[PDB]
Design a protein around this nucleic acid. Structure first.
Ligand code: MG
Ligand code: ZN
Lengths: 36, 129, 209, 135, 135
RNA sequence: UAUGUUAAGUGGAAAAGGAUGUGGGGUUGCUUAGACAACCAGGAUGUUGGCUUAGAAGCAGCCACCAUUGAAAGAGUGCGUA
């Protein structure tokens, strides 16, 4: 998981959600997982 | 809407004129069958001029509303492929039964032979004869 | 390096800097070379040197010459159109010894031999090459030179791949130089040369004549 | 019957134990007689060029040699008189074929193709004609 | 880097950046441009970096305009020097940009690559900008 | 007291930048001659298009990207097999 202040999608299969009051990206490719 | 309605209106009346001109109108449930399986029956019926078609349910019932049909109200459901047979009524009727024995997916029940809506029970006698 | 990459690399768009200014290239770049007979090695370029370089900077380049420190074949590109070429060559060896590159197979390659009038290039004497790195003969010449130097344990050995078992025909096409192939009713017959690792990896498939 | 019926187009007539006639039936115990001689027997007057042959194998070894027609791929070569196809397509044409020549090929394959309209079936040849680039 | 060829006086006042832009508050040459929303000093280094990143994405196709120029110069003192004893020596050149001033222009490229090229340029400048188009 | 906003203890500290938080306006497509989402069925023929390859069949790479049954099916949108 990449913890950076600039979470944004990288591919076309990326998705943006919100859990526990923060923005995160979950993707099938494990290299694309990001958290703010 | 105006573009949509005009195309829908024109196509609806085509079936009604075809249904009036057809000496026998039938339909079968094209569900769970190969794409070319119907084509085998369609090609044989193509040489006899017994080709069929399928459209939207609302448009399909629109033509039957004003084409002197009084027993097809309950027949506008499921996968409907109305077959027009104005040249050889007996041949298209027995054509459906020929494939029905070969393929169980074709339980044809629609019948408008002579313009009269025979029930699904009497269609089988028409289909087998 | 650019000529070799344009000659063999699949990603021919991947090029290197090329200019006349002092110290054009200051960073090492690695490229992967695929000779037509399905053989693989890498080719790296390094920053150049000048005379009486400060000793403070050679300590810093001790890191930048790690790739040459642990290598298999070196090429010492010596200019052949500048009369102080002997001095420049020797200076290169002292700088290399300062870094710590020794006991390394060196192949000298004098460049710019087009400029010199009435010279026979490409040639080869001992471990010395005369060539110009702007022609399609010198480059390929140096390629079979490298082929001689690096790959010398590729002995040939026939194979009989079972007909049902695929995935071995493909493997023995992108990792070997298939001399001849044959088809039988009990499988397929392959004759080619592979690395001594594969002689024990696929020892069972071989069949003796 | 017919457990597996994987279609295997091969060099009809001069069939050899090649991959085209190999692993396609190599999982069903294909015999040389059932791969080369079987096609040789069926392709007596169809030999020489490569034509497809669809075969079916049951649980027991069964050679269901059913040779396909001389497809438009081979037909396009003789009509256009090009040994190697023109990949240039619209970029350039290696050769060209007579307009009446396409009709003869289309008419010969007309029984195989399931198109009621013969005139429409000839139009399908244009796609095959355009596929090879050379008319 | 953009520097004046010669200047009448080497030293100038810092000035001020209050109010709207006097002129150049609209697009005239190209068809898209970067418009400043706030006001800040822009050195010549930031003009260069925001230009290489702006033509590199365009692959040298089409013309760009630079609507600002670093006329003013600024000075600085070395570390370890107390206050006084004159003024510092000039270091660089700046262009005070008040809000509402267009700094760049794009023409000769489609919609998609014009906005993207301007987007990369804006990240190299210390002002909040906006992509604006002609009419 | 009257009408609204915030769910962050924001209120009671701090930017470039990032975001399907939330409320209010505007411009618009489709739709009870049946809109989106789900469930059922179909999703094909010449044909494995040509070239290159040991191997290229929609899916290593480049070239035009057709007609046919039909109301739909792409000389094939992503998996996968060397
Ligand atoms: Mg260099
Ligand atoms: Zn992703």
């Amino acid at each position: 998981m990449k913890v950076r202040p600039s979470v944004k999608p990288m591919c076309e299969k990326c998705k943006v959600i919100r859990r526990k009051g923060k923005v995160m990206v979950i993707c099938e490719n494990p290299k694309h997982k990001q958290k703010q | 809407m105006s573009k949509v309605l005009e195309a829908k209106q024109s196509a609806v009346e085509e079936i009604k004129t075809k249904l009036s001109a057809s000496a026998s109108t039938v339909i079968v449930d094209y569900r769970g069958l190969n794409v070319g399986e119907i084509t085998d029956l369609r090609k044989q019926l193509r040489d006899a001029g017994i080709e069929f078609k399928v459209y939207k349910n609302s448009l399909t019932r629109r033509a039957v509303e004003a084409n002197g049909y009084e027993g097809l109200e309950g027949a506008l459901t499921g996968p409907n492929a109305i077959a027009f047979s104005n040249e050889d009524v007996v041949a298209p009727a027995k054509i459906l039964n020929d494939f029905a024995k070969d393929h169980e997916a074709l339980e044809i029940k629609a019948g408008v032979i002579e313009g009269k809506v025979a029930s699904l029970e009497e269609i089988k006698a028409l289909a087998t004869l | 390096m650019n000529g070799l990459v344009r000659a063999y690399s699949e990603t021919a768009d991947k090029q290197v800097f090329e200019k006349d200014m002092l110290f054009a290239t200051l960073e090492t770049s690695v490229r992967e070379i695929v000779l037509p007979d399905n053989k693989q090695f890498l080719l790296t370029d390094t920053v150049g040197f000048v005379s009486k370089l400060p000793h403070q900077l050679v300590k810093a380049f001790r890191s930048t010459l790690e790739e040459a420190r642990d290598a298999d074949l070196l090429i010492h590109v010596v200019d052949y159109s500048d009369p102080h070429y002997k001095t420049m060559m020797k200076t290169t060896e002292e700088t290399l010894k300062v870094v710590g590159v020794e006991d390394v197979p060196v192949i000298y390659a004098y460049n710019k031999a087009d400029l010199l009038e009435d010279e026979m290039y490409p040639k080869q004497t001992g471990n010395t090459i005369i060539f110009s790195a702007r022609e399609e003969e010198s480059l390929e010449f140096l390629t079979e030179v490298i082929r001689k130097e690096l790959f010398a344990s590729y002995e040939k050995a026939t194979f009989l791949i079972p007909f049902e078992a695929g995935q071995v025909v493909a493997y023995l096409n992108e990792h070997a130089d298939i001399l001849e192939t044959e088809y039988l009713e009990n499988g397929t017959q392959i004759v080619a040369e592979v690395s001594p690792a594969d002689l024990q990896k696929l020892a069972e498939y071989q069949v003796a004549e | 019957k017919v457990i597996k019926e994987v279609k295997l187009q091969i060099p009809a007539g001069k069939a050899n134990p090649a991959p085209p006639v190999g692993p396609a039936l190599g999982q069903a115990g294909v015999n040389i007689m059932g791969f080369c001689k079987e096609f040789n027997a069926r392709t007596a007057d169809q030999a020489g060029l490569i034509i497809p042959v669809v075969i079916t194998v049951f649980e027991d070894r069964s050679f269901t040699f059913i040779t396909k027609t001389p497809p438009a791929a081979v037909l396009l070569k003789k009509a256009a008189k090009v040994e190697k196809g023109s990949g240039e397509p619209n970029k350039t044409k290696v050769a060209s074929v007579t307009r009446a020549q396409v009709q003869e090929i289309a008419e010969t394959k007309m029984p195989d193709l399931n198109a009621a309209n013969v005139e429409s079936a000839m139009l399908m040849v244009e796609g095959t004609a355009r596929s090879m680039g050379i008319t | 880097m953009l520097v004046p060829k010669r200047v009448k006086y080497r030293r100038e006042f810092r000035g001020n950046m209050r109010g709207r832009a006097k002129g150049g508050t609209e697009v005239a040459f190209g068809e898209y441009g970067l418009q400043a929303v706030e006001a800040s000093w822009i050195t010549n280094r930031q003009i260069e970096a925001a230009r290489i990143a702006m033509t590199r994405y365009m692959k040298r196709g089409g013309k760009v305009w630079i609507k600002i120029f670093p006329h003013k110069s600024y000075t600085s003192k070395p570390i370890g020097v107390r206050m006084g004893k004159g003024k510092g020596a000039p270091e660089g050149w700046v262009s005070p940009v008040k809000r509402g001033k267009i700094m760049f222009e794009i023409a000769g490229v489609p919609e998609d690559v014009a906005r993207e090229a301007l987007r990369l340029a804006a990240h190299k400048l210390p002002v909040k900008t906006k992509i604006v188009k002609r009419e």
